[model samples]
Target: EAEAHKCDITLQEIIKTLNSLTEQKTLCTELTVTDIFAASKDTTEKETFCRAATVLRQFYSHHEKDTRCLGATAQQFHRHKQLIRFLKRLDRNLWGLAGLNSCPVKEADQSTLENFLERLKTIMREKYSKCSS
Candidate 1:
């Protein structure tokens, strides 16, 4: 159906964005540690995706409070705010791709965030590839 195709496109976009975010060199690494949403051995794939969506939204909401006082100049702060908005939009798009009824949100460092994003990229790509079969 057309719905399935749309879902695939969105998933692709989300994966692409995650790639860029993980690779970006600018911005403070500390703030990137939004929260922990690591999957346990017993957790289902759907549950892992759902928890990731929740934690991403939580990060966006927290950063939305003050884009002005990140101790950066006008241009740098603008970039910071832009990235935050990207996360916020990505969170909502993830909800659509996840096709979930509801979800939940953790503490993690920069490396942890990198690992989480990489894990999400792999999981999303797997889902996208499986969609055609």
Candidate 2:
């Protein structure tokens, strides 16, 4: 169970990395995690896993300028509450990725993924609303 959780945590990192790759452009957009694993064909499983994690953090910080933030917005309403939940779960997932958890961690299901997406949308909405104000 522990190993399975560790594996899923790494899988989330791979998915995040793939998302970054797709966000870049067409050339490497279709580059799946399978392709990355294939490229590092001879490396240990754990190495491939950690490489995928590094790829995601670097990819986002490098390719996408938007980094993670934890500030409350102008109207401490809807999005603020959602932001709390979103960031908390994201923190857990990332922490799990670091192999510091002891129990069966939460899977990156649809809801988990959507939480991050919703947080971004909230940030954009706040930025737009603030600009117009």
Which has the greatest lDDT? 1
Over the stretch 88-113, how does candidate 1's per-residue lDDT look in tens digits? 77787767756877555433433344
Clashing pairs for predicted structure model 2, backbone only: none
lDDT of 2 by residue, 70-129 (tens): 234544344334433433444445445456333221222222223333343343344334
TM-scores, all candidates, are 0.69, 0.29
In Å, residue 43's CA in model 2 sits off its true spot by 1.7
Off by over 4 Å in 2: 1-35, 66-133
Supply candidate 1's per-residue lDDT for 101: 79
